[PDB]
């Protein structure tokens, strides 16, 4: 693999902040990140935050309406990305929320690029202590489908995602 890649402290903090329980006020929550993208640096030595490429919880009621679809559209067509998506979903028992780590390697991306991203994946995944869920996607028409993520979280038990029907 490639374990000569570094993860910024700022990236790490972003992860940690996302798995926070609503002990804090109603303002930093809403400033909370619903989704976020990371990418490799030009030199392929760092995993860094892609600014602007994110969805804050505050945007959900107003700007966004569907957080999952908005997130899917953020996914570039020729470049690989890592992502964290904070999912909200329902079974027949409970309404739960879980952090999903996403590896995006779109078909049209250079094969060299996919290889490097995949080989370096462990460098960020290892630092994402207690992550649980991982989604690997190549095909846009497949991630686009809510059932894709839903099935990954809890399979057939999952009946809705982000308040929407599957």
């Amino acid at each position: 693999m490639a374990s000569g890649v570094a993860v910024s402290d700022g990236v790490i903090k972003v992860f940690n902040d996302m798995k926070v329980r609503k002990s804090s006020t109603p303002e930093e929550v809403k400033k909370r990140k619903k989704a976020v993208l990371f990418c490799l640096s030009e030199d392929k030595k760092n995993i860094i935050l892609e600014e602007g490429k994110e969805i804050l919880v505050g945007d959900v009621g107003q700007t966004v309406d569907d957080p999952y679809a908005t997130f899917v559209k953020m996914l570039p067509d020729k470049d690989c990305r890592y992502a964290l998506y904070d999912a909200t979903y329902e079974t027949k028992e409970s309404k739960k929320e879980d952090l999903v780590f996403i590896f995006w390697a779109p078909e049209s991306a250079p094969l060299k690029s996919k290889m490097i991203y995949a080989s370096s994946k462990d460098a960020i995944k290892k630092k994402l202590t207690g992550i649980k869920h991982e989604l690997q996607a190549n095909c846009y028409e497949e991630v686009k489908d809510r059932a894709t993520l839903a099935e990954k979280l809890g399979g057939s038990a999952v009946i809705s995602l982000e308040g929407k029907p599957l």
Copy 2:
């Protein structure tokens, strides 16, 4: 990369036979291969012919009717494959035929499996002297489309594939 993988003489012969000009009779032609699959061995040390997984030219008039669609369906859903497909297609100038090398790495395949196939790709590609065209595919709903291949062969100039409209 991985250059510790061997290509069988039988595989090599199959390639060479496919780029043959119709100097021979009308019987070995029709016994000619329209498409063929290769895969890595269990030990990942050989690139070998996957028997049964092929389309002979003779099947086209009768058993098959659409060679491209039939070929696409042969593509496994969880496993990577290499393939050669002998394409017949038309521009506004000429009706041509060309050999296309295909790398199939389906989304649902184990990431470990994709990596090994991709890293070993050069071992067979190098032995496919004067190949010209390569197609890499992850997403089934995309290879399925004739325009995918057509665009790869000659882009927008190509107006039909295997006698069919795009």
